[PDB]
């Protein structure tokens, strides 16, 4: 995202967001304006490829969604949410949507290419992050949720796989697939197993509190090297999540354990982020005592590590994926369903 009182700042941010939310950008590029180079990653819904824009020579990350698959997996409204929200937001730690368009067969979202790779790859390779390292990333997520939640937005898919490291060593949140603008509670069963809050699993109405729960799981995983609740099958994971019992590694500081006990708390009346002081309860927690919040926002804090970059189109920080031809039918598919995309 673009580089840099709180209430005043947020008021202006909401004004900017609403103008774009009410009148979304559309059809800002076309397929033949890019040369597709290689797949950077895939998920349950789309394929993200490194592409080069012909006229500018700039590299981007193009997310390709097969309309028919979107319908099959019942992600029509979710995908429309994804694009409408991403094109309207603006925060230092949110990936920027540069172009969006569609053709007979697919939907396309061209984002800034974040070359540092997924936090996931670095975390699994190194094993675990030191607490200062984990705290550096956590601070960026706390600020990002503060921003998103102020706009009545719930993210719903926080995980190392959806977090990218940029050239400066800072975080860039991607995959707004489950993002939604809602003022009340919502009920959709969505997210990723290890990060689902108890209320989602129990099919209960939930709110922004699930994002803070996810933050707790993310901090735990970053500092421990493994999730607080893991097993071989999702069902087994859900049973552990609902039990709520959490055990901490021997190296976790007392401050970190206290924070996690409050984030992964079953009592919503005591769960940090959803209390009277809201996000301030988190920002003022002892574990974040050394955190200079404004400096983080302004990206003035020294990053734990800067990813190795060889060139503008270097993809060495990403795994290799099997490639597939991107075909476009001569017949338009799901035209009316995605009219607003």
């Amino acid at each position: 995202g673009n580089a840099a009182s709180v209430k005043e700042f947020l008021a202006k941010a909401k004004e900017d967001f609403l103008k774009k939310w009410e009148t979304p950008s559309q059809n800002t590029a076309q397929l033949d304006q890019f040369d597709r180079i290689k797949t950077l990653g895939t998920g349950s819904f789309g394929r993200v490829m490194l592409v080069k824009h012909k006229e500018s020579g700039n590299h981007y990350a193009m997310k390709i969604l097969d309309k028919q698959k979107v319908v099959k997996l019942k992600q029509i409204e979710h995908t429309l949410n994804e694009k409408r929200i991403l094109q309207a937001v603006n925060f230092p730690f949110l990936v920027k949507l540069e172009f969006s368009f569609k053709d007979n067969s697919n939907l396309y979202m061209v984002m800034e290419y974040v070359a540092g790779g997924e936090m996931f790859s670095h975390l699994r390779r190194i094993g675990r992050f030191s607490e200062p390292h984990a705290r550096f990333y956590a601070a960026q997520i706390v600020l990002t949720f503060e921003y998103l939640h102020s706009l009545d937005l719930i993210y719903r898919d926080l995980k190392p796989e959806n977090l990218l490291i940029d050239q400066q060593g800072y975080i860039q949140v991607t995959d707004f697939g489950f993002a939604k603008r809602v003022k009340g509670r919502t009920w959709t069963l969505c997210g990723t197993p290890e990060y689902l809050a108890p209320e989602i699993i129990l099919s209960k109405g939930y709110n922004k509190a699930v994002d803070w729960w996810a933050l707790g799981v993310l901090i735990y995983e970053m500092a421990a090297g493994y999730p607080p609740f893991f097993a071989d099958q999702p069902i087994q994971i859900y049973e552990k999540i609902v039990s709520g019992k959490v055990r901490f590694p021997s190296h976790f500081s007392s401050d970190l354990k206290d924070l996690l006990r409050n984030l992964l708390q079953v009592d919503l009346t005591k769960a940090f982020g959803n209390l009277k002081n809201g996000v301030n309860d988190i920002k003022n927690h002892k574990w974040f005592a050394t955190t200079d919040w404004i400096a983080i926002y302004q990206r003035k804090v020294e990053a734990p590590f800067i990813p190795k970059f060889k060139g503008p189109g270097d993809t060495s920080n990403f795994d290799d994926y099997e490639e597939e031809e991107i075909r476009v039918s001569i017949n338009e598919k799901c035209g009316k369903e995605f009219t607003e995309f």
Binding site: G41, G43, S44, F45, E118, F120, R124, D157, K159, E161, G177, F178, L189, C190, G191, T192, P193, E194, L196, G225, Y226, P227, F230, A231, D232, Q233, P234, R247, P249
Partner: peptide, 18 residues
Amino acid sequence: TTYADFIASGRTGRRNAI
């Protein structure tokens, strides 16, 4: 150890959405 149990589990690779 918990770490050993995790590494021996079937979910140490990238996790896609439900």
